[PDB]
Amino acid sequence: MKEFYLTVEQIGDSIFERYIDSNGRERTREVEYKPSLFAHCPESQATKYFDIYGKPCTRKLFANMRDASQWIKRMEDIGLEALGMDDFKLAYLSDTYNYEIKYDHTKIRVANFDIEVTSPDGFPEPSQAKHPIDAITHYDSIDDRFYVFDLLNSPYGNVEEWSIEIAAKLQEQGGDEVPSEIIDKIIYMPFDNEKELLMEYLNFWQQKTPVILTGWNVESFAIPYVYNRIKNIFGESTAKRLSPHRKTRVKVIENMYGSREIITLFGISVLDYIDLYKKFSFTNQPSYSLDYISEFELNVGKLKYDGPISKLRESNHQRYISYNIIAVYRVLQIDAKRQFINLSLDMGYYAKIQIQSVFSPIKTWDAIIFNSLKEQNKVIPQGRSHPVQPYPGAFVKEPIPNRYKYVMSFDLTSLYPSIIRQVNISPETIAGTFKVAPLHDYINAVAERPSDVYSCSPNGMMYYKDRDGVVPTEITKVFNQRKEHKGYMLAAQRNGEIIKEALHNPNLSVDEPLDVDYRFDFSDEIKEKIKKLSAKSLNEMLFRAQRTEVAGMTAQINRKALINGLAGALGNVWFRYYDLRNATAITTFGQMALQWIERKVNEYLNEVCGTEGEAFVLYGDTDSIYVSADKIIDKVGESKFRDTNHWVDFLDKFARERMEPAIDRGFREMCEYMNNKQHLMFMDREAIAGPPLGSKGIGGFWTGKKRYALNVWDMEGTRYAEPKLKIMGLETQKSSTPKAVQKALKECIRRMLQEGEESLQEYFKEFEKEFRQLNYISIASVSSANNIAKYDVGGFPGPKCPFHIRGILTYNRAIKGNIDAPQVVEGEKVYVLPLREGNPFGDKCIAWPSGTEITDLIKDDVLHWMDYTVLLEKTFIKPLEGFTSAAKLDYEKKASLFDMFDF
DNA sequence: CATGTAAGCAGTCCGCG
DNA sequence: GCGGACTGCTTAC
Ligand SMILES: Cc1ccnc2c1ncn2[C@H]1C[C@H](O)[C@@H](COP(=O)(O)OP(=O)(O)OP(=O)(O)O)O1
Ligand SMILES: [Ca+2]
Ligand SMILES: [Ca+2]
Ligand SMILES: [Ca+2]
Ligand SMILES: [Ca+2]
Ligand SMILES: [Ca+2]
Numbered sequence: 001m002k003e004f005y006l007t008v009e010q011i012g013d014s015i016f017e018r019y020i021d022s023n024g025r026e027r028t029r030e031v032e033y034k035p036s037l038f039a040h041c042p043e044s045q046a047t048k049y050f051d052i053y054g055k056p057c058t059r060k061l062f063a064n065m066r067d068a069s070q071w072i073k074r075m076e077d078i079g080l081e082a083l084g085m086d087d088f089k090l091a092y093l094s095d096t097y098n099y100e101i102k103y104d105h106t107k108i109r110v111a112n113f114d115i116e117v118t119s120p121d122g123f124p125e126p127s128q129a130k131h132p133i134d135a136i137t138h139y140d141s142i143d144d145r146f147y148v149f150d151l152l153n154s155p156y157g158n159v160e161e162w163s164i165e166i167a168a169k170l171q172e173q174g175g176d177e178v179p180s181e182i183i184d185k186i187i188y189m190p191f192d193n194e195k196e197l198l199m200e201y202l203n204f205w206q207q208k209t210p211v212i213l214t215g216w217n218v219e220s221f222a223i224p225y226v227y228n229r230i231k232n233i234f235g236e237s238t239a240k241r242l243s244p245h246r247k248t249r250v251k252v253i254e255n256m257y258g259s260r261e262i263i264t265l266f267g268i269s270v271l272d273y274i275d276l277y278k279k280f281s282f283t284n285q286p287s288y289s290l291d292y293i294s295e296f297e298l299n300v301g302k303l304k305y306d307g308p309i310s311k312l313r314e315s316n317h318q319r320y321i322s323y324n325i326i327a328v329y330r331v332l333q334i335d336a337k338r339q340f341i342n343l344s345l346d347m348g349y350y351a352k353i354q355i356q357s358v359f360s361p362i363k364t365w366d367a368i369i370f371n372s373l374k375e376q377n378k379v380i381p382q383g384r385s386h387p388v389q390p391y392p393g394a395f396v397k398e399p400i401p402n403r404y405k406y407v408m409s410f411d412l413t414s415l416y417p418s419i420i421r422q423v424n425i426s427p428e429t430i431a432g433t434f435k436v437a438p439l440h441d442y443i444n445a446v447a448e449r450p451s452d453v454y455s456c457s458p459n460g461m462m463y464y465k466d467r468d469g470v471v472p473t474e475i476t477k478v479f480n481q482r483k484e485h486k487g488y489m490l491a492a493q494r495n496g497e498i499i500k501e502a503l504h505n506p507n508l509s510v511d512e513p514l515d516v517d518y519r520f521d522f523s524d525e526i527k528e529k530i531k532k533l534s535a536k537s538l539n540e541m542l543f544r545a546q547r548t549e550v551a552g553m554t555a556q557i558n559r560k561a562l563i564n565g566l567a568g569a570l571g572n573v574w575f576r577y578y579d580l581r582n583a584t585a586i587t588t589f590g591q592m593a594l595q596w597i598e599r600k601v602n603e604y605l606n607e608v609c610g611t612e613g614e615a616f617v618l619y620g621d622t623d624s625i626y627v628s629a630d631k632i633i634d635k636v637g638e639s640k641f642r643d644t645n646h647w648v649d650f651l652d653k654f655a656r657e658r659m660e661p662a663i664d665r666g667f668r669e670m671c672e673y674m675n676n677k678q679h680l681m682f683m684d685r686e687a688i689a690g691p692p693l694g695s696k697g698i699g700g701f702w703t704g705k706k707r708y709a710l711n712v713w714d715m716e717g718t719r720y721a722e723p724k725l726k727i728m729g730l731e732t733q734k735s736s737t738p739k740a741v742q743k744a745l746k747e748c749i750r751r752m753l754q755e756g757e758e759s760l761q762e763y764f765k766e767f768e769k770e771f772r773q774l775n776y777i778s779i780a781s782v783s784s785a786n787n788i789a790k791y792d793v794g795g796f797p798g799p800k801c802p803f804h805i806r807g808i809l810t811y812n813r814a815i816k817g818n819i820d821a822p823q824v825v826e827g828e829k830v831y832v833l834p835l836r837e838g839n840p841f842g843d844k845c846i847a848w849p850s851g852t853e854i855t856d857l858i859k860d861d862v863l864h865w866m867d868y869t870v871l872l873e874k875t876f877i878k879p880l881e882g883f884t885s886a887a888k889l890d891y892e893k894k895a896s897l898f899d900m901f902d903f
Numbered sequence: 904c905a906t907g908t909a910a911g912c913a914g915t916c917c918g919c920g
Numbered sequence: 921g922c923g924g925a926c927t928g929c930t931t932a933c
Contacts, residue, residue: 362904567906
């Protein structure tokens with residue numbers, strides 16, 4: 001097999017590399033790497049190295065990496081550019097793996113672990129590590145085994161061995177319901193004392209050294225706890241055995257509270273699953289406890305136990321250990337679904353970077369572009385210092401707030417990367433400038449053509465049309481991968497709807513799920529077989545289609561994120577190729593494109609409807625337009641449609657056969673106007689929206705920019721079995737909105753859009769009557785809590801103190817000197833509740849850590865003093881009044897003359 | 904050592920015979 | 921009690 005790296009580190013003048021050799025064996029080597037950098041040299045000198053602008057360079061080969069760094073500083077002092085890759089381990093990887101890396105994940109050791117630490121005096125701080133580690137579960141991906149290290153004797157209690165037989169039993173039979181599929185994979189190791197547990201764990205670690213190290217919150221808890229605990233017991237050198245190179249870096253961050261540490265383990269790639277999740281999931285959660293995320297991702301119930309975690313080991317050691325095991329497994333289950341470890345590996349090896357560098361789009365692109373340019377013997381420019389400078393972004397149309405009955409939307413494919421490719425935007429393709437007219441003159445096609453020679457953006461930039469740019473070249477490759485995966489995702493989604501349709505008439509038979517590839521639209525013959533399947537098989541097929549869809553979503557959305565990240569990187573001062581001319585060439589072109597096509601669509605639809613000057617495009621944001629389709633439907637007349645699906649088919653055909661060609665003609669003309677390299681402005685129909693035929697539903701509404709709701713029948717070619725709400729920006733979409741309120745507001749919208757005013761009023765009346773009976777957590781607001789200390793004046797709110805911060809301070813006083821209460825962690829999320837006047841908490845609100853029950857001692861008072869009136873008004877009534885006033889609807893029946901009668 | 908900007912809404916402070 | 925300037929937070933793209 002071809003060789004591939006596992007990890008790389010620079011330590012002084014040495015590169016330390018863990019890798020897989022040609023026989024599939026794990027190896028380590030220390031290489032005294034001799035790096036090269038470059039300096040501009042006189043033309044006359046015959047060299048083979050050129051910078052990106054074609055200026056000749058001379059190579060400087062250094063005896064070691066220190067000399068190379070020292071030369072960089074001398075060059076800075078002289079005032080001349082020091083060219084080449086200055087992160088030498090990227091140079092090392094590029095030199096060592098001068099081919100496309102094909103890695104074998106079954107050879108890469110992926111470790112998932114977590115630890116337990118009983119603490120009778122508050123949260124066990126990793127920086128102090130003053131309490132025994134009393135459980136470790138460490139799953140190894142090569143062994144496919146859960147190694148369980150269990151402390152039997154502790155200063156906090158002596159306990160019996162954990163029982164695998166009891167662990168396997170149903171909870172309803174007093175067991176722990178450790179999943180049956182992992183019972184046989186558990187290797188259980190009890191220990192009589194912590195020192196031997198830890199020594200054995202370290203020996204184990206030596207035998208089975210993680211390459212990728214992950215788990216839930218490992219970077220801020222488990223890792224520094226383990227490291228510091230070992231340091232305290234055995235000494236720092238022993239603790240450094242966690243690094244295969246025996247080298248660590250300890251980073252301490254302090255504030256007006258305590259101080260935590262992050263530990264860098266050289267030779268390991270730590271990918272905390274919480275960080276992966278935040279980056280790659282495109283959710284925003286109200287809590288990031290593993291209980292909450294597992295429930296959200298997998299629909300499994302919270303791991304329940306009685307009493308405080310500080311007493312769980314002594315009262316129920318059996319459950320304590322089982323829950324440690326299940327917690328490690330849940331992260332594996334989330335990853336089986338989401339496939340973020342897979343994505344990280346793909347991206348890391350594609351770029352030739354340390355795997356943990358996938359968190360940095362700047363590092364990822366620097367490496368990609370470096371490798372691309374190195375192939376052509378080109379020399380990359382020196383990174384420079386740039387002052388931060390705001391710059392203009394996209395255009396958003398101001399909508400008229402209203403109900404909108406029939407809506408069709410259109411969206412440009414991968415807009416910013418498509419602009420890069422169309423215009424040919426790259427550091428080395430800049431041809432010059434032209435004198436700009438106001439943007440409106442380009443939009444209306446009245447400005448003079450910018451150039452008949454170069455490819456242009458309305459920001460004044462010109463680019464060469466006849467040569468390739470590294471940015472367009474490399475962005476296209478990732479774009480093409482993204483497109484492939486998005487196709488798989490959409491196919492799986494269409495396939496799901498086929499299965500949901502067939503679930504309306506399940507067959508009474510004993511059969512099996514069909515063996516199919518869900519990434520491809522089902523054939524007619526598969527559709528025939530599906531129509532004869534039982535509910536059981538259909539449901540299993542539906543689960544599999546949805547899992548296929550999720551896998552496709554991970555793959556495409558994060559590749560989209562990467563390419564869009566390149567367009568944003570051009571506007572980040574830390575990017576080697578930072579250049580506002582290019583960042584701005586993109587955003588300004590986008591503004592033109594949106595507003596140009598708005599004009600073209602208005603013109604086209606007025607023409608085909610035989611009218612003049614009417615506004616069809618009601619809204620647009622960045623690269624999308626929303627077209628009112630009322631006049632289209634009225635042109636033929638609603639009477640003519642047999643059912644909802646009929647008018648949906650009609651609009652679908654209209655968009656594809658009439659509008660899209662006109663949109664295409666409009667953009668091809670724009671491309672000629674800007675004299676661009678390649679026409680890539682591809683704007684396809686997205687949503688078809690409307691009320692069910694014959695109902696009193698309003699179809700959709702806008703309240704303002706970035707705030708709307710639509711009843712959707714078809715989305716990007718997926719014809720839904722059941723209409724689906726597309727809601728953007730409204731409180732239902734915000735993680736700060738209480739859970740039960742999100743639910744209630746969404747049902748309010750559903751009723752407005754599908755059923756009408758009366759249906760809304762009936763629901764509102766019910767919700768208002770039942771509000772007070774909802775669980776307090778379901779109705780609590782949520783907020784992130786930054787700069788808590790900043791506003792903390794002897795436990796009381798300083799000036800301008802935010803509401804949620806005030807709640808935290810109220811909480812801190814309520815739990816003061818009471819060691820069993822969970823602390824609010826800076827930058828994390830809190831539940832928030834308003835309090836009625838005169839409450840024993842001495843203030844107007846309380847806040848506590850999100851995803852948790854409020855501590856038992858103050859829970860009773862919170863429940864008694866909660867201000868339901870304020871809560872209902874702020875979180876529910878006020879947003880709903882926004883929705884209904886925009887929609888020209890009432891959520892409560894208004895008074896009228898009819899009130900004089902007895903109905 | 905590290906993607907971007909646009910923009911809505913809740914909240915605090917201040918002005919208000 | 922509300923609106924205007926301002927911060928904080930969060931979402932749309
Ligand atoms: C998250 C994020 C970071 C940086 N830029 C972002 C972004 N989301 C959108 N944008 C910018 C770049 C996008 O090209 C543009 C339009 O957003 P949109 O979400 O339409 O995505 P787009 O890239 O066009 O991909 P599709 O093919 O799925 O439509 O808005
Ligand atoms: Ca635990
Ligand atoms: Ca788009
Ligand atoms: Ca599309
Ligand atoms: Ca059937
Ligand atoms: Ca869009």
